[PDB]
Amino acid sequence: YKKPKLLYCSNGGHFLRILPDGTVDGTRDRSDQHIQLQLSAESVGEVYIKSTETGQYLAMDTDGLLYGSQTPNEECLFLERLEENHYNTYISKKHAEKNWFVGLKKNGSCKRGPRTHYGQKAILFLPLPVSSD
Numbered sequence: 250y251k252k253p254k255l256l257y258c259s260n261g262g263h264f265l266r267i268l269p270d271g272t273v274d275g276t277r278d279r280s281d282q283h284i285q286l287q288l289s290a291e292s293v294g295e296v297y298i299k300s301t302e303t304g305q306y307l308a309m310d311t312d313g314l315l316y317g318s319q320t321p322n323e324e325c326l327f328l329e330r331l332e333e334n335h336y337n338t339y340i341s342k343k344h345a346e347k348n349w350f351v352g353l354k355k356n357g358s359c360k361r362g363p364r365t366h367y368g369q370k371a372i373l374f375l376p377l378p379v380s381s382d
């Protein structure tokens with residue numbers, strides 16, 4: 250169930266890097282994000298996103314941001330929606346009431362709180378097929 254996963258965003262370039270400070274940006278590697286991205290160990294739909302075997306912790310921001318600063322919390326539970334056609338959607342599982350689509354930019358400054366809807370960046374994430382089906 251666990252394998253070197255990555256979160257590629259079809260927005261010009263390669264995306265798969267996370268800074269301890271709590272920020273994700275562009276980068277190129279062999280399906281390995283910062284070291285090893287793990288997305289699995291949950292029920293159908295709900296997924297646990299782990300960045301780096303031991304060190305980083307992918308967590309969502311209450312306002313609208315995605316960080317990997319090691320901080321165990323429900324905010325780490327996300328919903329993975331793969332539509333097969335080389336694209337998937339992610340939403341804050343715990344915050345179903347505010348299912349705001351994620352999506353960052355090569356600059357690093359993600360865009361979830363500003364206004365997610367317009368632009369394929371909001372709905373055009375291509376990760377690794379490895380998931381807890």
Ligand SMILES: O=P(O)(O)O[C@H]1[C@H](OP(=O)(O)O)[C@@H](OP(=O)(O)O)[C@H](OP(=O)(O)O)[C@@H](OP(=O)(O)O)[C@H]1OP(=O)(O)O
Nearest residue numbers: 260352354358359360361363364365366367368369370371
């Ligand atoms: O209003 P913002 O917070 O500054 O975000 C916008 C917005 O991106 P999202 O609404 O998907 O978050 C634009 O999308 P559109 O509404 O125009 O479809 C996008 O334009 P692109 O579709 O070309 O990415 C633009 O990016 P850019 O400034 O490179 O044109 C980006 O601004 P930021 O990249 O600064 O977040």
